[PDB]
Structure 1
Amino acid sequence: SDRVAQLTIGNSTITTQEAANIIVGYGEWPSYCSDSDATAVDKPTRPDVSVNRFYTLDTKLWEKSSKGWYWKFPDVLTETGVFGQNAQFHYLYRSGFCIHVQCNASKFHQGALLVAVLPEYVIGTVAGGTGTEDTHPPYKQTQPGADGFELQHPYVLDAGIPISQLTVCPHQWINLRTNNCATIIVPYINALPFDSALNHCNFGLLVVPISPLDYDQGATPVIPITITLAPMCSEFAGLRQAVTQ
């Protein structure tokens, strides 16, 4: 009754029989922008069911040596479905998200993933190693799209900050002996009421193994991690031609 769950939005339904409750980021559900917080004067478009629905975007393989990955929002979805089209045809965008990370193994496998959402996840570089070069991360690294990107130095989250404190952010753990998914609801987080879905990623999703995957030889060795997410309360404004960058 805390372990079983069904999430239905749009024409999509997710089920899980080994859940660990649901986290509502910063204790606040997503909502549409009020007439007093808004500034842009055109009437927005709110497509509803055709964009607020679950999209399964990618699968990674968890290996005994995996470092961890990250995805950026709304970047992961800007080229997918009717949501993508709207994000491309409109200058302004805003929405919340329901994130459902999936990973099942067996009662004989073990390991624990930390699944967290970090708003304004700015990536740093190793500065030429010596720390004397002011190098910058390239586009494919700051906005990896649906493929996500692998962390080079998980301990400092590729940004000079301790992953040990990442739990100060909305998160759940997928500890194999306990659950097989993480569900996080994130409201729209920004210092502006609407923004560009292309130029700005409001938050990053981090999936990092903290207790490494293990099992005895002979047990299924391919343990996937699949990412499914749904935009909530999407609004778009400032219509013109479609743009991808």
Structure 2
Amino acid sequence: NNVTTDVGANGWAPTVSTGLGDGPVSASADSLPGRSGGASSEKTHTVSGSRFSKWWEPTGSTAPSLLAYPTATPVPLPNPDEPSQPGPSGDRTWLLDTVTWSQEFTRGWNIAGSNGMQWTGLESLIFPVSTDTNWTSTSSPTAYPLPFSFVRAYPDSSWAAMYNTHSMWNCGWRVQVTVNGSQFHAGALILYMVPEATTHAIQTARDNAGFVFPYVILNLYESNTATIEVPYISPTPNTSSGLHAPWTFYLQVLSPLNPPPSLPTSLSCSIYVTPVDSSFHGLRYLAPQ
């Protein structure tokens, strides 16, 4: 017990899969040779260690500031090419956007500025994502899709240079926001990192259960800044350039800004973005996002 079902258990050689009786078939781990990638922070990619004959041959936030998830283990890559790394010119803290936070904003109000995008999941994204109609909307923007917003903000960076030149990329992300209020100010913002942002996922991030996602709170009672970092995620070991946003940043309001009387009714915020441990595979011609 060992519930009454059968998870596996598995079998082999003719135990759980013979011509007399059967249990449910299970897939085994594929042991592959190749260059160690996928998991950011711990890249250290190096060489690894035909096999058939032919017929013609003879608690929580805003406590500390640590990664939302712990970094995972590297895996052997399918492609044999050596990656191109931007280094310190790419992996650095960039000023993503500067946005205003007024008291009129209520619970679960996503805040974004000029470099941000209106993305509640219902917007019809015209391909490619670099089309101006995606970023300019009748209402205020809400999200910061990575790396789409980062590449648009700095199209001339070494990170974006390789991003428009390689078919696939791999890096983590660190977002920080600084909001200075006097000791007389009150209010709280939440820095959300939403994986694979879609209609239902973004609306549940506004709600009470949203704290399942990576989060840190920027409470004006004690903090002036809050940092959050997330390692790389994707269904593939390397993400396709211009066609996939693994992480998206959301700066929403938990407790509406409560400024002291006779002071401004809004505070300025500065959003930063940091790609962590970047590698790019498959060099070819320039194809922007």
TM-score (norm 1): 0.72
Of 86, 93, 96, the residue aligned with 2:162 is 86
Partner SS for 1:98: strand
| More strand, by proportion | 1
- In structure 2, how many angstroms separate the alpha carbons of the residues matched to 1:96 and 1:161? 21
CA deviations 1:158-187 (Å, max 9, x no partner) are 4x6662111111111011011111111110
Provide closer, same or farther for how the CA distance between residues 161 and 225 of structure 1 changes in structure 2, counting only shifts above 3 A: closer
Q: Unpaired runs of 5+ in structure 2?
A: 1-61, 112-142
Cα separation, partners in 2 of 1:184 and 1:48, compared to 1, 3 Å: same
Larger Rg: 2
Contact 1:23 1:170 in 2 (8 A): no
Counterparts of 1:227 and 1:242, CA distance in 2: 29
Matches of 1:157 and 1:178, distance apart in 2? 28
Match of 1:212 in 2: 256
Q: Where does structure 1 differ by over 4 angstroms across 4 or more consecutive aligned residues?
A: none
Q: Please report how far the alpha carbon of residue 89 of structure 1 lies from its aligned counterpart in structure 2 after TM superposition.
A: 0.8
The separation in 1 between residues aligned to 2:147 and 2:205, in whole angstroms, is 23
Give, in angstroms, the shift of residue 42 of structure 1.
1.3
The corresponding residue for 1:167 is 211
Does residue 56 of structure 1 match 2:95? yes
Q: Give the Cα–Cα distance (whole angstroms) in 1 for the partners of residues 194 and 208 of structure 2.
A: 13
> How far off its partner does 1:28 sit?
2.4
Question: Which residue of 2 is the match for residue 179 of structure 1?
Answer: 223
1:240 matches 2:279: no
Cα gap change, 1:170 to 1:234, in 2 (>3 Å): same
Distance change (3 Å), C-alpha of 1:93 and 1:111: same
Match of 1:73 in 2: 146
Distance (Å, rounded) in 2 between the aligned partners of 1:162 and 1:108:
27
**CA deviation profile, 1:90-144 (whole Å, cap 9, x unmatched):** 11101001211111111111111111111111136xxxxxxxxxxxxxxxxxxxx
Give the conservation status (yes or no) of the 8 Å contact 1:75–1:197. no
Rounded to whole Å, the distance in 1 between the matches of 2:241 and 2:220 is: 34
Contact 1:23–1:171, Cα closer than 8 Å, also in 2? no
Structure 1 vs Structure 2 CA RMSD: 2.0
Task: Indicate conservation of the 8 Å contact 2:205/2:211, yes or no.
Answer: no
> 8 Å contact 2:150–2:273 — kept in the other structure?
no
Q: Which runs of 5+ in 1 are unaligned?
A: 1-18, 125-155
Q: Which protein has greater RCO, CA pairs closer than 8 Å, 6+ apart?
A: 1
Matched AA of 1:197: S
Question: Cα 1:161–1:228, aligned 2, differ >3 Å: closer, same or farther?
Answer: closer
Q: In the alignment, is the contact (CA less than 8 A) between 1:101 and 1:181 conserved in 2?
A: yes
For residue 146 of structure 1, what is the aligned residue in structure 2?
none
Q: Identity across aligned pairs (percent)?
A: 26
2: CA distance between counterparts of 1:110 and 1:162? 20
For 1:29-87, what per-residue CA distance to the aligned partner results, in whole angstroms no more than 9, with x for missing partners? 7x8x54x1x11221111221111001101111001122223211111222421111111
Structure 1 pair 161–172 and aligned structure 2 pair: CA distance change class (3 A): closer
Give the one of 174, 184, 189 matched to 1:113.
189
Q: Distance in 1 between matches of 2:68 and 2:160?
A: 24
Residue identity opposite 1:167 in structure 2: F
Instruction: Sort the Cα spacing of 1:76 and 1:224 in 2 relative to 1 into closer, same or farther, 3 A.
Output: same
